[PDB]
Design an enzyme around this catalytic site. Sequence first.
Site, PDB file in Angstrom:
ATOM      1  N   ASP A   1      -4.665 -15.958  12.488  1.00  0.00           N
ATOM      2  CA  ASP A   1      -3.957 -17.386  13.090  1.00  0.00           C
ATOM      3  C   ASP A   1      -2.322 -17.118  13.120  1.00  0.00           C
ATOM      4  OD1 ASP A   1      -6.605 -18.338  12.756  1.00  0.00           O
ATOM      5  OD2 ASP A   1      -5.972 -19.351  10.835  1.00  0.00           O
TER       6      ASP A   1
HETATM    7  N1  LIG Z   1      -4.613  -5.370   5.083  1.00  0.00           N
HETATM    8  C1  LIG Z   1      -3.607  -5.580   5.757  1.00  0.00           C
HETATM    9  N2  LIG Z   1      -2.498  -5.083   5.658  1.00  0.00           N
HETATM   10  C2  LIG Z   1      -1.351  -5.549   6.509  1.00  0.00           C
HETATM   11  N3  LIG Z   1      -1.396  -6.213   7.690  1.00  0.00           N
HETATM   12  C3  LIG Z   1      -2.904  -6.734   7.583  1.00  0.00           C
HETATM   13  C4  LIG Z   1      -3.586  -6.493   6.918  1.00  0.00           C
HETATM   14  N4  LIG Z   1      -4.955  -7.196   7.449  1.00  0.00           N
HETATM   15  C5  LIG Z   1      -4.511  -7.767   8.237  1.00  0.00           C
HETATM   16  N5  LIG Z   1      -3.152  -7.757   8.462  1.00  0.00           N
HETATM   17  C6  LIG Z   1      -2.235  -8.414   9.795  1.00  0.00           C
HETATM   18  O1  LIG Z   1      -2.806  -9.405  10.096  1.00  0.00           O
HETATM   19  C7  LIG Z   1      -3.273  -9.152  11.662  1.00  0.00           C
HETATM   20  C8  LIG Z   1      -4.586  -9.513  11.944  1.00  0.00           C
HETATM   21  O2  LIG Z   1      -5.658  -9.156  11.006  1.00  0.00           O
HETATM   22  P1  LIG Z   1      -7.331  -9.467  11.263  1.00  0.00           P
HETATM   23  O3  LIG Z   1      -7.519  -8.979  12.411  1.00  0.00           O
HETATM   24  O4  LIG Z   1      -7.840  -8.759   9.901  1.00  0.00           O
HETATM   25  O5  LIG Z   1      -7.229 -11.034  10.909  1.00  0.00           O
HETATM   26  P2  LIG Z   1      -8.464 -12.008  10.837  1.00  0.00           P
HETATM   27  O6  LIG Z   1      -8.027 -13.761  11.267  1.00  0.00           O
HETATM   28  O7  LIG Z   1      -9.701 -11.628  11.622  1.00  0.00           O
HETATM   29  C9  LIG Z   1      -8.873 -11.887   9.174  1.00  0.00           C
HETATM   30  P3  LIG Z   1      -9.351 -12.724   7.689  1.00  0.00           P
HETATM   31  O8  LIG Z   1     -10.713 -13.052   7.843  1.00  0.00           O
HETATM   32  O9  LIG Z   1      -8.809 -12.002   6.568  1.00  0.00           O
HETATM   33  O10 LIG Z   1      -8.599 -14.455   7.946  1.00  0.00           O
HETATM   34  C10 LIG Z   1      -2.980  -7.630  11.804  1.00  0.00           C
HETATM   35  O11 LIG Z   1      -3.051  -7.352  13.298  1.00  0.00           O
HETATM   36  C11 LIG Z   1      -2.023  -7.374  10.643  1.00  0.00           C
HETATM   37  O12 LIG Z   1      -0.789  -7.630  11.523  1.00  0.00           O
END
Ligand SMILES: Nc1ncnc2c1ncn2[C@@H]1O[C@H](COP(=O)(O)OP(=O)(O)CP(=O)(O)O)[C@@H](O)[C@H]1O
Lengths: 336, 336
Positions: A291
């Site tokens: 988000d």
């Molecule tokens: N382990 C990590 N370390 C650093 N940045 C991370 C990270 N996991 C996510 N990010 C950051 O967040 C962005 C989106 O990550 P992701 O695609 O995992 O989100 P999402 O909404 O699917 C995950 P969640 O289910 O944890 O809310 C990535 O592009 C990166 O900038």
Amino acid sequence: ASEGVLLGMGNPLLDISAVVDDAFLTKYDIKLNNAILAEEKHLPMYDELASKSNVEYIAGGATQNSIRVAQWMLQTPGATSYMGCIGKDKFGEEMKKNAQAAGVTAHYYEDETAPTGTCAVCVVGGERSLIANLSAANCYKSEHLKRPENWALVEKAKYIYIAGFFLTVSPDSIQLVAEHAAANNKVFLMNLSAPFICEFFRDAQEKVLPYADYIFGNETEAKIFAKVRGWETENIEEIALKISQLPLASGKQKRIAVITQGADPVVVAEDGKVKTFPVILLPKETNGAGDAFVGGFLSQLVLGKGIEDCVRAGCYAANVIIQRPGCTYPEKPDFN
Amino acid sequence: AASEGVLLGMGNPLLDISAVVDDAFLTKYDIKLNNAILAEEKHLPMYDELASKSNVEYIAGGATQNSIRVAQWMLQTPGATSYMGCIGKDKFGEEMKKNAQAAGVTAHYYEDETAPTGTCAVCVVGGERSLIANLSAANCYKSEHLKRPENWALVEKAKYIYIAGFFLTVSPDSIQLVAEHAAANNKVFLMNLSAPFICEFFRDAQEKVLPYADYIFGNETEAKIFAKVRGWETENIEEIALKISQLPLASGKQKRIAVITQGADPVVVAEDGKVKTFPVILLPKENGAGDAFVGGFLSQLVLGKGIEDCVRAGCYAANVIIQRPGCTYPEKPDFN
Ligand SMILES: Nc1ncnc2c1ncn2[C@@H]1O[C@H](COP(=O)(O)OP(=O)(O)CP(=O)(O)O)[C@@H](O)[C@H]1O
Ligand SMILES: Nc1ncnc2c1ncn2[C@@H]1O[C@H](COP(=O)(O)OP(=O)(O)CP(=O)(O)O)[C@@H](O)[C@H]1O
């Protein structure tokens, strides 16, 4: 960054975040790094969290979080707008109070009986436990959007972002504004967050895809989107290209597909080419990271910046939010 | 010969308003054949036009209720089936009660004080159809209705309780309460993979009910998506069915049977670590086929018959429903 230049529509949930202990997690039988749908036993939990003085109330919901993060990143007052359904109760008034504090011009639709959607965000260290009660967030009607004081937000908006989840709540609203954006030179953006995957919602999504100038998603959402429509490939770079090359509507010329992979690079497809963007961390560094990424990306897109700036801002905002309890942020940003 | 209320169903009831339509009708309301469209509000000019048609047919529909009506029709023993679901206090709610009674189903509905009854226009031309569903009151079921004694008596009477996976989005408390009760009181709890889940709120809700499922029904698309969600890399439907039958089991649950239909291709059944294939047998000179298959399967399961009888009855009921407008059937069955 003009007045109401960016608009969002979705399922608003008042996130009631608080740091909790073992006794609290054992009492309501809730586990960390898990998100569950709220039950009868979890309904009195929102009163124990309120009784805590250290509680944080946030106008949440996937799209509203992206809008608040974009407003925080832009800093120009009155640049963002949001429309969504809430109830006529104390949590609805707290949603209006926090949206105003976050700088978002929110025009909510108040349901006459369903209570406001809420989400308990219990935090221990970096880990969290979500317990969402969607309730009023799934009751938005297109009659609210069609009213002149709310349709003025669509007319003012140049960029309109709506999550794919909203196709299950109000498919008339998303289709109406997506077709309007194509007719009046506006950028319509959406994401692949389609939890339900029935024939009813697949055909609803098929109708809005031609009108999407930008399609955001994560590796899991993109891999499932590919398997649904028979695309046998599993490579995220190939799937992103196939998303950007989906049929385009008359009022569209090109599509940009942004697929995040958490720690792995952000994949962007544009003009028949795919570019990879390694994630850059903040000095001495997952809930709501997606988000916050969309929010940071939207802020630079509003300012008419290149794709690399949109990915860097998205990663910056996602890195800030993950180092904080919930989808919160400091007073002013420190991005370039 | 089945006992009173031996089979119970719980779901999202929708009054299916079926009628044979022409090109002018489909063009007038801009609706396509072989397409499942949501209706945010009841399109009154269309609904009234359907109500004023030759051979207009009102049916107490909804995926689970269709399976229950087909099971009652297949069993023929009066009072053998029961059903609980949410309806509104309006004319369509009275037609739902009238048709459920005609179909032989003892239905105990929960009447919402403001949401109108869920409806679905089934515009049929030849073999193809067009669904326009307005869920409205069907998504408002509360566990307080189930916990009342006159409604909980249906759970106590029931030996077999079938609930679709989609109902997890409406009332996860009701599913957990009856699934845990079935494990404690030697009852067979059955469910399906309808509307596969991608969001963590709905995925974790399904993860909690899977150990309590003695039978898990599904189609090749639902099973392939279920496999991709939980990281199972295999795409072979026979391997997926085996992996579903071998998911963790709750205390006092010795085994699980997974039934995955493949439309024209054979029905796949996993039991005791082995997978068996069942070719589809057609009737002399041959949508809602999945609901009718589960209904026919449930009827023979109630009579204490072997798996082959349950698959044959399921295929018989599906082959009858597909050669009729909607999920309708003749007075008596011809399967022995
Ligand atoms: N382990 C990590 N370390 C650093 N940045 C991370 C990270 N996991 C996510 N990010 C950051 O967040 C962005 C989106 O990550 P992701 O695609 O995992 O989100 P999402 O909404 O699917 C995950 P969640 O289910 O944890 O809310 C990535 O592009 C990166 O900038
Ligand atoms: N083309 C066909 N010819 C004959 N029988 C068929 C058929 N398609 C389906 N069936 C019957 O219906 C059963 C269930 O089929 P399927 O798995 O396609 O249902 P479903 O509910 O997923 C389909 P729909 O989306 O069309 O309602 C099969 O096991 C078979 O008995």
